[PDB]
């Protein structure tokens, strides 16, 4: 089948530059345009335009004008798109348009990459977890997070298997600037708040989960 | 321009759901009803304005009248809730524009009520004299945001942050808002009770200074 590739998530500065790469392969290469849209989070999706597989001529949309600039390489086989004076509001995911469906005509845009993410962020974390007393209840009303926490897609949780289990994963609030990834695993049991495993936190600058120390003590 | 289509449906399951797509340039261009399941790609449901791709079950229909296009879906499943959208071209043909999007969704998450549990403050924010407690909801239908942390107390609107109503696991959705207070305003107040609103409840966690 046609198989469709976009690149890894980048996130840059506002005012930067930005590069990501759409792959296509595995349909007839005489004339198959690929479309590029843009969707904010919770919004409507928006069309940036549409690029030659191998004709060359290209169209861009009559909103977006001059930091527009769809550049594909034929024997690549790969479609590179330069967008100059990166904005707030161009925080958003980028999709790709191609076609597969078998009862012929273009302007159905039938598959769809994994898209590529774009969001502009620093990067923080936070230590303890919590020092409070151990609850009555079964239940952690403290666990491993990290507070104030600007690095995007943070993933605060224990090092070990322990407290995993259970855990609601926290949302991202980011009322300030910092994005205070909370990242909030709570090990839902009394005997696990008394003794919890330290608390990983990975955040934006190391992708790895660098190991660091988040404990109940309950 | 711009097609318009309602934001939003709320359709019972067992009953036909019709989404409205409207332009001037319509009755002279094809749509493309597109289906976009919460966090994955969009995939054709409709294409033509009247047939389906294949894999496409029966249920979806698409029809054209005037300067309006209808997608019916008769006997709406529990899977069905999505995002659709129409897809057209405008006057000059050359520009490719989507609609707005109708959020389909069946009659509704597991109600329940409000819960509220204040973290403790950390060692680390009591030294940096910014004690806080955050309260995370663990699930509930259709939660509302509201935060109100009353530590000693009214509402502060610094003392707690609004947050997204995430999806929750279990057929829910999980609310966690982050709320951060200074540490001589906990110290002032007696207790840190903060009370987080979701799901048409509140519920207030309590905490000793």
């Known amino acids: 089948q046609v198989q469709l590739v976009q690149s890894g998530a980048e996130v840059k500065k506002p005012g930067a530059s930005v590069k990501v790469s759409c792959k296509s392969s595995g349909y007839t290469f005489t004339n198959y345009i690929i479309h590029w849209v843009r969707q904010a989070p919770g919004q409507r999706l928006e069309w940036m335009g549409w690029?030659?597989?191998?004709?060359?001529?290209?169209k861009y949309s009559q909103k977006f004008q001059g930091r527009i600039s769809v550049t594909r390489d034929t024997s690549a086989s790969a479609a590179y798109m330069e967008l100059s004076s990166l904005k707030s509001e161009d925080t958003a995911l980028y999709y790709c348009?191609?076609?597969?469906?078998?009862?012929?005509?273009?302007?159905?845009?039938?598959?769809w990459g994994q898209g590529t993410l774009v969001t502009v962020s620093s990067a923080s974390t936070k230590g303890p977890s919590v020092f409070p007393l151990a609850p009555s209840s079964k239940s952690t009303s403290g666990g491993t997070a990290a507070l104030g926490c600007l690095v995007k897609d943070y993933f605060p949780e224990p090092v070990t298997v322990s407290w995993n289990s259970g855990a609601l994963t926290s949302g991202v609030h980011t009322f300030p600037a910092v994005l205070q990834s909370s990242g909030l695993y709570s090990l839902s049991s009394v005997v696990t708040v008394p003794s919890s495993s330290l608390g990983t936190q990975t955040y934006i600058c190391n992708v790895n989960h660098k190991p660091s120390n988040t404990k109940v003590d309950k | 321009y711009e097609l318009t289509q309602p934001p939003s449906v709320s359709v019972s399951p067992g009953q036909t759901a019709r989404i409205t797509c409207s332009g001037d340039?319509?009755?002279?261009?094809?749509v493309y009803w597109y289906q976009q399941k919460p966090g994955q790609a969009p995939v054709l449901v409709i294409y033509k304005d009247s047939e389906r791709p294949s894999g496409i079950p029966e249920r979806f229909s698409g029809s054209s009248s005037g300067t309006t296009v209808t997608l019916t879906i008769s006997g709406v499943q529990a899977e069905d809730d999505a995002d659709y959208y129409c897809?057209?071209?405008?006057?000059?043909?050359?520009?490719?524009?989507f609609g707005t999007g109708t959020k389909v969704t069946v009659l509704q998450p597991k109600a329940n009520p409000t819960v509220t549990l204040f973290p403790p403050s950390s060692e680390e924010l009591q030294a940096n004299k910014a004690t806080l407690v955050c309260l995370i909801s663990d699930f509930y239908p259709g939660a509302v945001t509201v935060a109100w942390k009353a530590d000693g107390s009214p509402v502060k609107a610094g003392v707690e942050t609004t947050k997204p109503s995430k999806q929750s696991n279990n057929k829910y959705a999980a609310s966690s808002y982050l709320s951060l207070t200074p540490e001589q305003w906990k110290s002032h107040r007696s207790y840190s009770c903060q009370v987080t609103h979701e799901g048409s409840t509140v519920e207030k966690t309590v905490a000793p200074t």
């Open positions: 690029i030659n597989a191998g004709n060359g001529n290209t």
């Open positions: 340039a319509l009755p002279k261009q094809y």
């Open positions: 348009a191609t076609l597969q469906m078998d009862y012929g005509g273009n302007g159905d845009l039938d598959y």
């Open positions: 897809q057209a071209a405008d006057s000059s043909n050359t520009e490719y524009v």
